[PDB]
Symmetry: D2
Subunit: 77 residues, 4 copies
Amino acid sequence: LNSTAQGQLKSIIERVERLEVEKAEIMEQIKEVYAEAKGNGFDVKVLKKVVRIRKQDRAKRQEEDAILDLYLSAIGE
Amino acid sequence: LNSTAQGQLKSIIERVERLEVEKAEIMEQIKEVYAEAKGNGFDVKVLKKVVRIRKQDRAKRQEEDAILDLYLSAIGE
Amino acid sequence: LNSTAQGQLKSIIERVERLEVEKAEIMEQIKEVYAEAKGNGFDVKVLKKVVRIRKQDRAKRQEEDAILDLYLSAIG
Amino acid sequence: LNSTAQGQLKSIIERVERLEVEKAEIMEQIKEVYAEAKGNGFDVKVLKKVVRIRKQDRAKRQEEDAILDLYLSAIG
């Protein structure tokens, strides 16, 4: 490669690595939060469920819940 | 639940949501970096490959490369 | 390597590849099944949800649903 | 729903569940195969690497390896 692409390559790699570090840090902090959360007697799986359903559209969520209920009753299961 | 667990639940949820936001932001920034990187004529897949192999132990990496080469030659493929 | 390990390696690789092919077939067929499911006006995502929750223990399922609802009501 | 869609739903669910079971069998067998592979002193990860790279086009594989090496040499 040329000197330009060499320096650009080093730059890109370094910036990406830094961002990955910050990202990893955030992830670890989240894990810490869930750890103390479990440290207060909360169900982490259910908490993650709440987080997952609070990102979804409420209308489509309640829709999928209604359809779900419908399907479960439709088969007797 | 009791008022304590209610407030703690709200707190946990809010903090986790914030951390998720920061995390998402970091991810988006990474995507931006790879976008301008591709904007300079670089192979993003290969870049990700470099990032992935720069996290691994060099000794075990070169090991797996030697073993790989060995296996490929062993079968004529 | 020695010739023995070479032939054995070829064997292993072939075995794994064949199993991977069969796995691919299964996945493709499943894809076709869900396509047939939506072709009759069914929600594929919800169907997958039904399948995934039928793998879980029912008592723990209705339990986790109860805890979920409890928390959601706790925060509105 | 109507009785027809109820029976059809039962059918679909059963079909999907059976396919999932067969898929599980395939995965379990693969697990057994790699266990047999390491039982003869082979690197399972590297074997999986061989399998995964044999799915890719060889020209593009050796090409991506060349670009990789080029970049790594470019940065040492």
